[PDB]
Design a protein around this motif. Structure first.
Motif, PDB file in Angstrom:
ATOM      1  N   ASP A  71       1.139  -9.961 -33.976  1.00  0.00           N
ATOM      2  CA  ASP A  71       2.360 -10.208 -33.227  1.00  0.00           C
ATOM      3  C   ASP A  71       3.020 -11.536 -33.529  1.00  0.00           C
ATOM      4  O   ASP A  71       4.202 -11.703 -33.186  1.00  0.00           O
ATOM      5  N   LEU A  72       2.292 -12.501 -34.089  1.00  0.00           N
ATOM      6  CA  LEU A  72       2.783 -13.857 -34.254  1.00  0.00           C
ATOM      7  C   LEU A  72       3.470 -14.020 -35.605  1.00  0.00           C
ATOM      8  O   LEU A  72       3.037 -13.458 -36.632  1.00  0.00           O
ATOM      9  N   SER A  73       4.496 -14.841 -35.626  1.00  0.00           N
ATOM     10  CA  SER A  73       5.172 -15.231 -36.857  1.00  0.00           C
ATOM     11  C   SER A  73       4.794 -16.646 -37.288  1.00  0.00           C
ATOM     12  O   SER A  73       4.314 -17.462 -36.498  1.00  0.00           O
ATOM     13  N   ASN A  74       5.024 -16.919 -38.557  1.00  0.00           N
ATOM     14  CA  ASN A  74       4.719 -18.191 -39.218  1.00  0.00           C
ATOM     15  C   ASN A  74       3.227 -18.518 -39.128  1.00  0.00           C
ATOM     16  O   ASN A  74       2.834 -19.668 -38.955  1.00  0.00           O
ATOM     17  N   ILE A  75       2.408 -17.480 -39.283  1.00  0.00           N
ATOM     18  CA  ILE A  75       0.960 -17.624 -39.439  1.00  0.00           C
ATOM     19  C   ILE A  75       0.645 -17.741 -40.933  1.00  0.00           C
ATOM     20  O   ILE A  75       0.948 -16.812 -41.683  1.00  0.00           O
ATOM     21  N   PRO A  76       0.089 -18.858 -41.410  1.00  0.00           N
ATOM     22  CA  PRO A  76      -0.193 -18.969 -42.856  1.00  0.00           C
ATOM     23  C   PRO A  76      -1.264 -17.983 -43.284  1.00  0.00           C
ATOM     24  O   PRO A  76      -2.139 -17.614 -42.501  1.00  0.00           O
ATOM     25  N   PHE A  77      -1.188 -17.565 -44.566  1.00  0.00           N
ATOM     26  CA  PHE A  77      -2.211 -16.720 -45.157  1.00  0.00           C
ATOM     27  C   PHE A  77      -3.571 -17.358 -44.946  1.00  0.00           C
ATOM     28  O   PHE A  77      -3.741 -18.556 -45.183  1.00  0.00           O
ATOM     29  N   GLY A  78      -4.525 -16.562 -44.480  1.00  0.00           N
ATOM     30  CA  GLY A  78      -5.878 -17.041 -44.234  1.00  0.00           C
ATOM     31  C   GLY A  78      -6.180 -17.420 -42.800  1.00  0.00           C
ATOM     32  O   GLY A  78      -7.336 -17.745 -42.487  1.00  0.00           O
ATOM     33  N   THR A  79      -5.181 -17.407 -41.931  1.00  0.00           N
ATOM     34  CA  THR A  79      -5.345 -17.681 -40.504  1.00  0.00           C
ATOM     35  C   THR A  79      -5.223 -16.370 -39.735  1.00  0.00           C
ATOM     36  O   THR A  79      -4.329 -15.573 -40.030  1.00  0.00           O
ATOM     37  N   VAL A  80      -6.077 -16.182 -38.720  1.00  0.00           N
ATOM     38  CA  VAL A  80      -6.009 -14.946 -37.952  1.00  0.00           C
ATOM     39  C   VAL A  80      -4.658 -14.836 -37.230  1.00  0.00           C
ATOM     40  O   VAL A  80      -4.064 -15.846 -36.825  1.00  0.00           O
ATOM     41  N   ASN A  81      -4.177 -13.603 -37.072  1.00  0.00           N
ATOM     42  CA  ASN A  81      -2.950 -13.317 -36.298  1.00  0.00           C
ATOM     43  C   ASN A  81      -3.409 -12.545 -35.064  1.00  0.00           C
ATOM     44  O   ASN A  81      -3.328 -11.320 -35.003  1.00  0.00           O
ATOM     45  N   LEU A  82      -3.974 -13.289 -34.096  1.00  0.00           N
ATOM     46  CA  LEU A  82      -4.618 -12.715 -32.920  1.00  0.00           C
ATOM     47  C   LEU A  82      -4.247 -13.551 -31.716  1.00  0.00           C
ATOM     48  O   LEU A  82      -4.378 -14.781 -31.738  1.00  0.00           O
TER      49      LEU A  82
ATOM     50  N   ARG B 169       6.096 -17.048 -31.934  1.00  0.00           N
ATOM     51  CA  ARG B 169       5.908 -17.880 -33.124  1.00  0.00           C
ATOM     52  C   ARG B 169       4.676 -18.775 -32.973  1.00  0.00           C
ATOM     53  O   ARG B 169       4.358 -19.235 -31.877  1.00  0.00           O
ATOM     54  N   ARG B 170       3.990 -19.028 -34.073  1.00  0.00           N
ATOM     55  CA  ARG B 170       3.040 -20.135 -34.065  1.00  0.00           C
ATOM     56  C   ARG B 170       3.782 -21.370 -33.556  1.00  0.00           C
ATOM     57  O   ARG B 170       4.884 -21.666 -34.002  1.00  0.00           O
ATOM     58  N   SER B 171       3.184 -22.103 -32.633  1.00  0.00           N
ATOM     59  CA  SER B 171       3.824 -23.318 -32.175  1.00  0.00           C
ATOM     60  C   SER B 171       3.982 -24.277 -33.337  1.00  0.00           C
ATOM     61  O   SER B 171       3.130 -24.344 -34.230  1.00  0.00           O
ATOM     62  N   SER B 172       5.077 -25.043 -33.327  1.00  0.00           N
ATOM     63  CA  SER B 172       5.461 -25.793 -34.532  1.00  0.00           C
ATOM     64  C   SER B 172       4.427 -26.833 -34.902  1.00  0.00           C
ATOM     65  O   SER B 172       4.316 -27.226 -36.076  1.00  0.00           O
TER      66      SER B 172
END
Length: 277
Positions: free
Chosen positions: A260-271, A188-191
């Motif tokens: 692989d990451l969850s809770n990544i907002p639209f427009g942010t890389v998921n890397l 997960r994206r850290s809170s």
């Protein structure tokens, strides 16, 4: 090489999947590279640095890390047990006081110091700077980080811990450096992690075990903990000849675990940073 029972973040850097505990890496281990940890200092006497750490500059009466933050970050770059690049040379620049604060003028002066000081040092595989710090948007802070990158240093900076868009923080918002968000052991994206189009990459940042002052260890959380994973990965890859200071951020993004990451907002890389070993 394989480190068993590694901190989860090190294991994560060398796996396509979460939940493993062995860190697999090439034995070169960043030998011949150098990483400046621009922070509260480094307890360079800690056994985990094996003599590979030294303070080179302070902006306060003392060069001692009276906080622990800088020692923790330096351990994630380069300590024997908790580090990504276990043979790198570590240089400490104390721009933050023992409460973890510093004036923007001091942080700027510290970056300019590194840009020059690297010419006093033997770093045949190249130079990285890890900046686990930041505050509100400042064009002058961003420009200092851009100069440090332009001078030939791979600059990695924390996105910030505001659960907000990093466009409003510095040096996170400087486009030309490597802006690092934080993830947790379940991908997960850290809170607390900032997000936004300016992020380049994520690294492990929740519950990161590393070195601490008094010859100790401890686990803490922040984009400050993610940043040195990326700084150490860049040093490792530069030592291997796979990339350069100028291109290491892009290369890390090119070769990252994607999606692989969850809770990544639209427009942010998921890397998520990955050594592909």
């Amino acid at each position: 090489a394989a480190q068993t029972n590694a901190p989860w973040g090190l294991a994560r850097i060398s796996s396509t999947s979460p939940g493993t505990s062995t860190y697999y890496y090439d034995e070169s281990a960043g030998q011949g590279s150098c990483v400046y940890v621009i922070d509260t200092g480094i307890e360079a006497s800690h056994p985990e640095f094996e003599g590979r750490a030294q303070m080179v500059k302070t902006y306060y009466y003392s060069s001692r890390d009276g906080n622990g933050h800088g020692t923790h970050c330096a351990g994630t770059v380069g300590s024997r047990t908790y580090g990504v690049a276990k043979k790198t040379q570590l240089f400490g620049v104390k721009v933050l006081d023992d409460n973890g604060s510093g004036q923007y003028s001091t942080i700027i002066a510290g970056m300019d110091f590194v840009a020059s000081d690297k010419n006093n040092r033997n770093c045949p595989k190249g130079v990285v700077a890890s900046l686990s710090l930041g505050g509100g948007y400042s064009s002058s802070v961003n420009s200092a980080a851009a100069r440090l990158q332009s001078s030939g240093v791979m600059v990695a900076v924390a996105a910030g811990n505001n659960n907000a868009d990093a466009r409003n923080y510095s040096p996170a918002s400087e486009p030309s450096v490597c802006t690092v968000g934080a993830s947790d052991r379940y991908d997960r994206r850290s809170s607390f992690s900032n997000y936004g189009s300016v992020l380049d990459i994520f690294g492990p940042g929740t519950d990161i075990l590393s070195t601490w002052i008094g010859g100790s260890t401890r686990s803490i959380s922040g984009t400050s903990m993610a940043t040195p994973h990326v700084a150490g990965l860049a040093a490792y890859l530069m030592t291997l000849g796979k990339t350069t200071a100028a291109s290491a951020c892009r290369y890390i993004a090119d070769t990252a675990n994607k999606g692989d990451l969850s809770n990544i907002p639209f427009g942010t890389v998921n890397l998520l940073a990955y050594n592909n070993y």
